[PDB]
Design a protein around this ligand. Sequence first.
Ligand SMILES: *[C@@H]1O[C@H](CO)[C@@H](O[C@@H]2O[C@H](CO)[C@@H](O[C@@H]3O[C@H](CO)[C@@H](O)[C@H](O[C@H]4O[C@H](CO)[C@@H](O)[C@H](O)[C@@H]4O)[C@@H]3O)[C@H](O)[C@H]2NC(C)=O)[C@H](O)[C@H]1NC(C)=O
Ligand SMILES: *[C@@H]1O[C@H](CO)[C@@H](O[C@@H]2O[C@H](CO)[C@@H](O[C@@H]3O[C@H](CO)[C@@H](O)[C@H](O[C@H]4O[C@H](CO)[C@@H](O)[C@H](O)[C@@H]4O)[C@@H]3O)[C@H](O)[C@H]2NC(C)=O)[C@H](O)[C@H]1NC(C)=O
Ligand SMILES: *[C@@H]1O[C@H](CO)[C@@H](O[C@@H]2O[C@H](CO)[C@@H](O)[C@H](O)[C@H]2NC(C)=O)[C@H](O)[C@H]1NC(C)=O
Ligand SMILES: *[C@@H]1O[C@H](CO)[C@@H](O[C@@H]2O[C@H](CO)[C@@H](O)[C@H](O)[C@H]2NC(C)=O)[C@H](O)[C@H]1NC(C)=O
Ligand SMILES: *[C@@H]1O[C@H](CO)[C@@H](O[C@@H]2O[C@H](CO)[C@@H](O)[C@H](O)[C@H]2NC(C)=O)[C@H](O)[C@H]1NC(C)=O
Ligand SMILES: *[C@@H]1O[C@H](CO)[C@@H](O[C@@H]2O[C@H](CO)[C@@H](O)[C@H](O)[C@H]2NC(C)=O)[C@H](O)[C@H]1NC(C)=O
Ligand SMILES: *[C@@H]1O[C@H](CO)[C@@H](O[C@@H]2O[C@H](CO)[C@@H](O)[C@H](O)[C@H]2NC(C)=O)[C@H](O)[C@H]1NC(C)=O
Ligand SMILES: *[C@@H]1O[C@H](CO)[C@@H](O[C@@H]2O[C@H](CO)[C@@H](O)[C@H](O)[C@H]2NC(C)=O)[C@H](O)[C@H]1NC(C)=O
Ligand code: NAG
Ligand code: NAG
Ligand code: NAG
Ligand code: NAG
Ligand code: NAG
Ligand code: NAG
Ligand code: CA
Ligand code: CA
Ligand code: CL
Ligand code: CL
Ligand code: ZN
Ligand code: ZN
Ligand code: ZN
Ligand code: ZN
Lengths: 696, 696
Amino acid sequence: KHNMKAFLDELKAENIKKFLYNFTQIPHLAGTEQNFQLAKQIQSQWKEFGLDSVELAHYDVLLSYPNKTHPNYISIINEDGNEIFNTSLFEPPPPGYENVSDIVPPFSAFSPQGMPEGDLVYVNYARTEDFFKLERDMKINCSGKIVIARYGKVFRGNKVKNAQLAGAKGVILYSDPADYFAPGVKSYPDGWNLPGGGVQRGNILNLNGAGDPLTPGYPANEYAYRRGIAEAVGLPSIPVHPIGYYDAQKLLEKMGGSAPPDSSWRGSLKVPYNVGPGFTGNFSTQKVKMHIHSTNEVTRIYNVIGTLRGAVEPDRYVILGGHRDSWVFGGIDPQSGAAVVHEIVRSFGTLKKEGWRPRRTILFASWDAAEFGLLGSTEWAEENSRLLQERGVAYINADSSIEGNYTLRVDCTPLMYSLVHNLTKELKSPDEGFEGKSLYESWTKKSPSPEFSGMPRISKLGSGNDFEVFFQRLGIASGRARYTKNWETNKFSGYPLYHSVYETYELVEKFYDPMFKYHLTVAQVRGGMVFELANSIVLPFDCRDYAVVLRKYADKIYSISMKHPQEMKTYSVSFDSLFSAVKNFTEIASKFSERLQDFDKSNPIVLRMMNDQLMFLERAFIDPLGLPDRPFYRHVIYAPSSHNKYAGESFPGIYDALFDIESKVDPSKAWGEVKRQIYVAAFTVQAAAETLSEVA
Amino acid sequence: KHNMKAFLDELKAENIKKFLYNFTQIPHLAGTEQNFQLAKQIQSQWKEFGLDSVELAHYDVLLSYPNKTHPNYISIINEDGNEIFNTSLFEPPPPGYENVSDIVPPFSAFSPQGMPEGDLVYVNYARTEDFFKLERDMKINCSGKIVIARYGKVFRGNKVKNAQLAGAKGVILYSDPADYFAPGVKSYPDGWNLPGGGVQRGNILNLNGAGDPLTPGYPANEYAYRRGIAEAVGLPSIPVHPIGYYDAQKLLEKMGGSAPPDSSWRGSLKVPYNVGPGFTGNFSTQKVKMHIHSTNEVTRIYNVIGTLRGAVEPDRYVILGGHRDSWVFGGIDPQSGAAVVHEIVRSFGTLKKEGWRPRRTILFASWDAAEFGLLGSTEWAEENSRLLQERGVAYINADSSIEGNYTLRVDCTPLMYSLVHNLTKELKSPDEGFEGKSLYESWTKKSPSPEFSGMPRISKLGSGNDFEVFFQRLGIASGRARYTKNWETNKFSGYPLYHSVYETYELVEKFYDPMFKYHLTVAQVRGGMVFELANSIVLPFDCRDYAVVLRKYADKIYSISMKHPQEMKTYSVSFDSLFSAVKNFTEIASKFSERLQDFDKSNPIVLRMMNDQLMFLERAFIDPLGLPDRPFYRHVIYAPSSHNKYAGESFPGIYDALFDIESKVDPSKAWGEVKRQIYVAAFTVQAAAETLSEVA
Ligand SMILES: *[C@@H]1O[C@H](CO)[C@@H](O[C@@H]2O[C@H](CO)[C@@H](O[C@@H]3O[C@H](CO)[C@@H](O)[C@H](O[C@H]4O[C@H](CO)[C@@H](O)[C@H](O)[C@@H]4O)[C@@H]3O)[C@H](O)[C@H]2NC(C)=O)[C@H](O)[C@H]1NC(C)=O
Ligand SMILES: *[C@@H]1O[C@H](CO)[C@@H](O[C@@H]2O[C@H](CO)[C@@H](O[C@@H]3O[C@H](CO)[C@@H](O)[C@H](O[C@H]4O[C@H](CO)[C@@H](O)[C@H](O)[C@@H]4O)[C@@H]3O)[C@H](O)[C@H]2NC(C)=O)[C@H](O)[C@H]1NC(C)=O
Ligand SMILES: *[C@@H]1O[C@H](CO)[C@@H](O[C@@H]2O[C@H](CO)[C@@H](O)[C@H](O)[C@H]2NC(C)=O)[C@H](O)[C@H]1NC(C)=O
Ligand SMILES: *[C@@H]1O[C@H](CO)[C@@H](O[C@@H]2O[C@H](CO)[C@@H](O)[C@H](O)[C@H]2NC(C)=O)[C@H](O)[C@H]1NC(C)=O
Ligand SMILES: *[C@@H]1O[C@H](CO)[C@@H](O[C@@H]2O[C@H](CO)[C@@H](O)[C@H](O)[C@H]2NC(C)=O)[C@H](O)[C@H]1NC(C)=O
Ligand SMILES: *[C@@H]1O[C@H](CO)[C@@H](O[C@@H]2O[C@H](CO)[C@@H](O)[C@H](O)[C@H]2NC(C)=O)[C@H](O)[C@H]1NC(C)=O
Ligand SMILES: *[C@@H]1O[C@H](CO)[C@@H](O[C@@H]2O[C@H](CO)[C@@H](O)[C@H](O)[C@H]2NC(C)=O)[C@H](O)[C@H]1NC(C)=O
Ligand SMILES: *[C@@H]1O[C@H](CO)[C@@H](O[C@@H]2O[C@H](CO)[C@@H](O)[C@H](O)[C@H]2NC(C)=O)[C@H](O)[C@H]1NC(C)=O
Ligand SMILES: *[C@@H]1O[C@H](CO)[C@@H](O)[C@H](O)[C@H]1NC(C)=O
Ligand SMILES: *[C@@H]1O[C@H](CO)[C@@H](O)[C@H](O)[C@H]1NC(C)=O
Ligand SMILES: *[C@@H]1O[C@H](CO)[C@@H](O)[C@H](O)[C@H]1NC(C)=O
Ligand SMILES: *[C@@H]1O[C@H](CO)[C@@H](O)[C@H](O)[C@H]1NC(C)=O
Ligand SMILES: *[C@@H]1O[C@H](CO)[C@@H](O)[C@H](O)[C@H]1NC(C)=O
Ligand SMILES: *[C@@H]1O[C@H](CO)[C@@H](O)[C@H](O)[C@H]1NC(C)=O
Ligand SMILES: [Ca+2]
Ligand SMILES: [Ca+2]
Ligand SMILES: [Cl-]
Ligand SMILES: [Cl-]
Ligand SMILES: [Zn+2]
Ligand SMILES: [Zn+2]
Ligand SMILES: [Zn+2]
Ligand SMILES: [Zn+2]
């Protein structure tokens, strides 16, 4: 038989290991020759594996690189203009790689050039709430200061946006051991912790889903008209540079001014964590000086796109995509995902060689330039948006397969909840103590959902990865799955060696997954989801699961508003329309589910009419006018949080209209906008409900 | 047999006559009780006729009405403040209707209130080119003046926009006999010409496709959040009022200042057509004073929506829609169309009663408030936009069936050209001298296409009627057909009694179509188009016809740009990408047509996959970012002209970027924007082409 079990059984941990080794011996930075050569290798291999067509889709997009002959660094400068301390020019390379060329030194991609000098203010995580605390409670003014912030909690681009709007002239980002050094584990190469010379790379753009900063809306093809740099989307206006904790220690140790407001502002270094501004008495005349000389450059990038044509519905696409570009070796990010995609393609190809084809078309993607703002996936989706919004069934992401070895993590649309539950009940748990038990059993035990008995946690989708354009712009049902850690307060912080030179094959093989069993389990989940989406006669989406969550999100947004009962009375702010819409959605989804179970099965038009209702249900949550000042975030139920791109927010338009509303100067206008957002959300939920009604 | 011939043969001229009489005995102004009662009658009748469901869809939208106890008028005022001449308070009613109540007097809907007094400037048709002539050539300054303009040539809302931006404080619109009095024909009631007391009503909004001015983007339902009036969309900022030619004569006869620049500025009245400003010496101290007291009021409107469920593809909609609201009796506009829709529904219902159903679902619509800005169609399309863009096959409009008795007029998407040619070859010509000949033969003889031998003229779609939201916002293939006059320079001016109290049943029965043969022919064309769209196995769209027109439009826009060869050299302005896209579209459409003719006919999935490619081809020309500053006009190939809503423009984004470009202060920026629009158009044409490629 060619069934899901045949597909799953063909996947091998040993192949995933071999591929991961193959993908991680040299750097594959976006826009470099080494990453083009890897694209060509993957293209050739996917052809050999059996795909019907495998093409490169290239674009010319804005990238950012340090200047090789004018390196980035930070100094402490004395009154004479002597630089008495300098931060490192590179991370000490790991054992056996000290002679590898073309390791890009740590930098913040898309930082502008400059050499700002001034006094430091320490801003904790540079979160919205941290800047509120500084400014409103502590009366500390960031204007004209260099801010030093610890990485963690939220996306670094939000930190830099928050610093900019506070008036900062520069941002120094550093990794505090509190957030990146797990107790009782050795630093790399002797364990998986971050050494004091390690540094987290990463872009600091605020693109809000636009893709290439020069061509918002349209693919960056050969005849593209480009914005001038001054009109580009998302570029930071102040210099930014990341450092490790040995260097941070030298910068923080002299800090004066005000004490930290409380212990949530103190990291683990042996410094006071004084907020500043500036240094203590003896060193009051010293300043900090940045030297940033990186350049932005339009550069060719290459996606690999493989097609396995459907036998019955070739005009319906199930997409498995993940990126290929890395900051350095990409041992976890992204090659632990790319190796899993490679083995999934090989397995599907084995079935294809035996005469099988999936019911629907499967597209496989190796995206480029994800590290520079999801550029490859976004430009391709812009090029192909008409095909995707009329034919796109689902997108399954495949960045890193592991960020820990504790349990499964799944973030996806409610439409995929039942698919994931059913699939995980059929897979073996790889966990110690759960031999002979299902993955569903181990996952549910280790990661219980807050609301339900005997149910696992599934998170919402925001941004930070290549599902963003498919889900948030185009409204295609999307999902992701990986193995994760236990550490809840570190959820959005990354694993310790994230985006460092230390992220290697050895890191994974020695410390995370020696048997490649967690990688194999993740391959089974991602591959199984793709298999069911591409082969099930009826699409495996349960609209009733959306009805359940919409009521939870309505209760939640109502509770936020109800912090302000007087204003709700004054401005007649009613959530009645939203609850009515959710009630109607619940009722109509229940009836649709009855018809889906009961319709005449011999009738392919009723089936496909029904399959189209399922497919276009996620699409119905798209508003073609987008969210306020964010035209490329169009999903009305989910958006990336306006305070943290990594986090999904529910009913974001209402949430943002309510956020900090007590501080708005014109409460009538602010509450008017809350009421407008309630109307848009109620309307969108009712309109989505009506797509599931009988069609005529 | 239940075939198209059975449907067509059931249509009767006598029924259309009876319905027209029934719909035109009393006024049916939008938002009034009489129009709600007609909606209920139509709902009941469509049910009796056999439709599966017939519902009212209501909305609460901004409408505009004169004040019944404070009438609108214009005066000539002397230096003492004596009003020595006043314009009429109503049109003399036609014979037999002098005791009909609730005839709304002539007014410009959505005029603000005011009583501006000042000196007149005569602005010809108030076209863009007329204001260029005044300001740039004649050095006449409209600022603070009351402008008097003759109706004709372009939509009156464009006249008022042009007057506003020229600085005018008021606009008087009048009907010149040059434009509304055909030589050798008697005035109503003794012929079809406009009497000197007749007045053309009409709204003067500039909504750019938004619908209700208070709820752009979203249906004006019971929980809608409404813009405040100050933020409303499209409202004029200066008072406006229409008058007839007896009253215009009294206003123009004293005009002084500069002579008309040439004979194209002179109408037919026995006045000098002096441009002004102000009156000649003896009356130099007299002014003109407007008195406008109309009010804008949120008012309930009602669409009737009838469904005839498809037997095979009930989730595919073919829509026949036209409006029901009239300014007064609506003898031509819209009841000559509504009567034809009524007879089409009755005929389809006769087949349904015998056991027939169409293959696809047919929706029939009686729209409200079209005269106030296409409000009914637009709010309904906003409510149902997700259903329409995933399921909408085609929209056929059905406003007035006649505006003359000379020949057929068809405006439609290229996708419908072959359908219209084939259908008209099978219908009988109603014309004198063409008995026994086809409608195609008479039409092609009377209205030859400029480019082709033995082909009829078909025009482009702009706005001005209820197809606008379906075609320009949502990208659903649309068409319209009616009988028309010979008068080419009057094409956008209306027939003489347009929007006057004289537009009655008697006008039609005595002067336009005594035998109702032209109405029957129009019923055959509109009904036949609906029949073929709802019943043909393969959708009757020919993508190759789009390829032909796209090359014509590319040649045309290139020729406009080539008026400026130096600038094209300087700014490197290349149309190569657009021609390449059009070439690719031509090639891919040809191959798709081969597959369509040759595909396995026993295969319903390939058929429907192919039918979906046909259906989504018009959809592919939509840009989700819309046209510049016009978010609700989203079709990249067509938009309503920015100078005349009635006219369609091709490649509007490039056309507007080039328009008057020699006058722009920053040529680098202006030519940059031309290049941007070329890129967007080339990309959109290539993306539409690619929807017709093999799907995988
Ligand atoms: C959830 O689905 C239900 C359908 O099961 C749907 O109920 C609809 O609610 C609307 C708005 O509440 C109802 O609107 C009424 O329609 C009648 C005509 O049928 C009008 O006469 C009513 O207007 C009068 O009363 C208003 C309220 O006091 C006044 O403001 C107004 O000026 C009039 O005096 C009113 O428009 C509609 O009939 C039902 N439809 C049904 C029951 O089938 C509900 O809207 C859905 N929820 C959402 C968010 O869409
Ligand atoms: C109409 O359809 C045709 C396909 O039949 C399609 O042709 C494509 O044109 C593009 C752009 O002209 C070609 O792009 C080239 O791709 C190769 C790799 O295949 C690149 O090496 C080329 O880049 C080099 O040369 C450029 C131009 O001098 C330089 O600017 C650049 O820096 C590089 O040095 C270039 O990108 C593409 O290969 C073809 N595809 C084919 C022939 O299959 C055409 O684009 C379509 N029209 C539209 C409007 O889409
Ligand atoms: C990664 O694996 C690929 C695929 O086997 C290797 O590329 C092949 O290398 C051999 C020997 O140089 C060539 O003959 C083949 O043509 C290559 N095949 C391709 C590119 O498809 C590559 O050497 C491996 N890389 C590493 C670092 O081990
Ligand atoms: C930090 O780096 C800077 C730049 O390399 C050093 O300053 C330079 O030192 C050389 C050699 O004496 C001078 O000729 C240059 O003029 C200096 N460049 C400057 C000030 O921009 C500095 O000495 C280093 N500091 C430490 C502690 O190593
Ligand atoms: C997940 O599995 C459950 C249990 O098998 C599926 O629910 C059953 O679906 C079948 C077929 O429609 C019904 O006959 C049963 O009554 C359902 N049992 C229930 C709800 O307990 C469910 O459809 C699967 N979900 C998918 C495939 O998305
Ligand atoms: C237009 O035609 C309709 C339909 O025949 C007429 O409405 C009917 O009038 C009779 C007598 O008053 C009633 O018994 C019916 O119930 C009505 N039917 C409806 C509304 O569906 C209406 O009288 C005609 N109007 C004119 C001006 O002739
Ligand atoms: C034009 O209409 C106005 C308004 O009705 C007339 O002016 C009014 O005349 C009455 C009666 O004498 C006065 O009491 C009012 O004060 C006037 N209203 C004004 C000036 O606003 C005017 O006489 C009419 N002119 C003609 C030629 O008929
Ligand atoms: C209009 O009529 C023409 C002539 O009948 C149709 O063109 C024919 O279509 C059939 C069926 O595919 C082909 O076998 C013939 O070769 C075509 N003849 C031609 C192109 O001369 C055409 O399809 C009709 N257009 C519609 C229905 O939109
Ligand atoms: C890198 O550094 C030096 C110093 O400005 C300069 O010569 C060179 O142009 C720079 N490279 C760039 C800006 O790409
Ligand atoms: C911060 O400091 C600068 C002084 O240079 C001042 O212009 C700015 O308004 C200050 N902001 C606050 C909140 O005090
Ligand atoms: C793998 O799991 C073990 C057992 O819980 C733990 O001690 C170790 O730290 C884990 N490794 C990583 C990288 O999380
Ligand atoms: C109509 O006219 C009079 C004069 O202002 C006034 O009493 C009444 O309010 C007006 N009606 C309106 C504005 O609807
Ligand atoms: C028209 O007249 C007014 C004088 O009130 C002036 O402000 C305006 O600039 C003038 N425009 C031109 C083009 O002369
Ligand atoms: C109808 O046609 C005749 C013959 O051409 C013409 O004399 C008459 O003016 C027409 N009527 C109208 C309303 O156009
Ligand atoms: Ca782009
Ligand atoms: Ca609206
Ligand atoms: Cl992922
Ligand atoms: Cl029409
Ligand atoms: Zn990644
Ligand atoms: Zn990453
Ligand atoms: Zn009309
Ligand atoms: Zn009209």
